Design a protein around this ligand. Structure first.
Ligand SMILES: [Zn+2]
Ligand SMILES: [Zn+2]
Ligand SMILES: [Zn+2]
Lengths: 319, 78
């Protein structure tokens, strides 16, 4: 005959739809997920009678704003991509390597291993979006499927394809906030326009794309001013619990004997004009722990192309 | 509500002018850069003052002013 189903986006608000057993879910309603599986192209039967379904296509007006409440300001394709990506990465595994968790290699997800393992070191961050923060807490508890899929959905990552660990890592952190104070003050001046200080606080004072050493971050910068002259900018105060600097792959010789100041970094292997490979590295006990997608190996010395570099807390004041 | 002129710089260090509106999306600016530079949208991402530009957000949310310098970043594939 006909079944009644509960349609939800939030799990606490439901809409009743009655369907026939003559057409598929996709033609009668849209794309639906039942217990994490896609059943849009199946015919409704009594097994789903009286059960809740997670709808992705053709959201109603109220379900759309409930969606913006749960996931933030997302586009209409977002919910379908997240639901599909989540069941696609069902087979993926977090493997314990030397007391920490690393993403086993599967379907070109090595960039995700670099992103997640870097995020796992930032133990002072929180997400403002409720669905993202929930998946983050589930990840830290041992179930990472939700977090992985949401990260890929917010990042516009296509399944099974390589991508950019730096871009995704900083895109994710743009949605986060710091649980302590942090602050960086820039001084900008132009001989015609004058001088002015710019202040950033919170987690935005802890990430920067464009340099890969603290010395380069602290150097003077010069660029065209709105008046046409040359404007300068220089870091003048910096207090943070950590510092994440990212740039293009840059070959360096990482060495324990000199005892470097950074605590972790990411490496791109290969040439940048082609599909390469990511490794996540950490400094512990006078060695470099190299986390390569569920495997770990250790070296005192490593010539490698660095992308992201994680430094400890900053305490700086100049001029 | 009129447009303003910002700058996007490529990998080689060359800055080009773009007429934009603060209400337009980053995705819309990425299409302008893609046309001028000759590189598809999913091959690069934009940063301003060390921060990434999210595609679906409007430019006004990043404090762009006339002759602000946005950086073009190659999107690696690892
Ligand atoms: Zn659909
Ligand atoms: Zn579908
Ligand atoms: Zn000036």
């Amino acid at each position: 005959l006909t079944i009644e189903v509960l349609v939800t986006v939030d799990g606490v608000n439901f809409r009743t739809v009655v369907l026939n057993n003559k057409n598929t879910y996709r033609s009668q309603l849209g794309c639906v997920f039942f217990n994490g599986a896609d059943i849009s192209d199946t015919i409704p039967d009594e097994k789903q009678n009286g059960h809740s379904l997670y709808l992705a296509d053709n959201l109603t007006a109220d379900e759309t704003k409930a969606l913006k409440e749960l996931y933030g300001p997302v586009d209409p394709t977002f919910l379908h991509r997240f639901y599909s990506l989540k069941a696609a990465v069902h087979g993926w595994k977090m493997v314990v390597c030397d007391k920490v968790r690393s993403l086993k290699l599967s379907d070109n997800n090595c960039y995700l291993n670099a992103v997640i393992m870097t995020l796992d070191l930032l133990k002072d961050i929180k997400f403002v979006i409720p669905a993202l923060q929930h998946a983050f807490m589930k990840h830290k508890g041992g179930d990472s499927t939700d977090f992985i899929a949401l990260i890929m959905a917010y990042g516009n990552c296509t399944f099974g394809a390589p991508d950019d660990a730096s871009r995704l890592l900083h895109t994710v952190l743009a949605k986060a906030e710091l649980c302590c104070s942090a602050r960086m003050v820039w001084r900008e001046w132009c001989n015609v326009c004058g001088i002015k200080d710019v202040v950033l606080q919170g987690l935005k004072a802890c990430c920067y794309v464009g340099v890969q050493t603290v010395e380069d971050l602290r150097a003077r910068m010069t660029y065209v001013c709105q008046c046409g002259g040359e404007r300068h900018r220089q870091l003048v105060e910096h207090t943070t619990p950590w510092l994440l600097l990212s740039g293009t792959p840059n070959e360096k010789l990482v060495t324990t004997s000199t005892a470097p100041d950074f605590v972790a970094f990411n490496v791109f292997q290969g040439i940048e004009t082609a599909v390469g490979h990511y490794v996540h590295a950490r400094l512990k006990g006078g060695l470099i722990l190299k986390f390569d997608s569920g495997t770990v190996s250790k070296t005192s010395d490593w010539k490698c192309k660095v992308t992201d570099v994680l430094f400890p807390g900053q305490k700086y004041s100049s001029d | 509500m009129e447009p303003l002129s910002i700058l996007v710089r490529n990998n080689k260090g060359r800055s080009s002018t773009y007429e934009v509106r603060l209400t337009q999306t980053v995705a819309h600016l990425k299409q302008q850069v893609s046309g001028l530079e000759g590189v598809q949208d999913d091959l690069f991402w934009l940063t301003f003052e060390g921060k990434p530009l999210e595609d679906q957000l409007p430019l006004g949310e990043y404090g762009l002013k006339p002759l602000s310098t946005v950086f073009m970043n190659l999107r690696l594939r690892g």
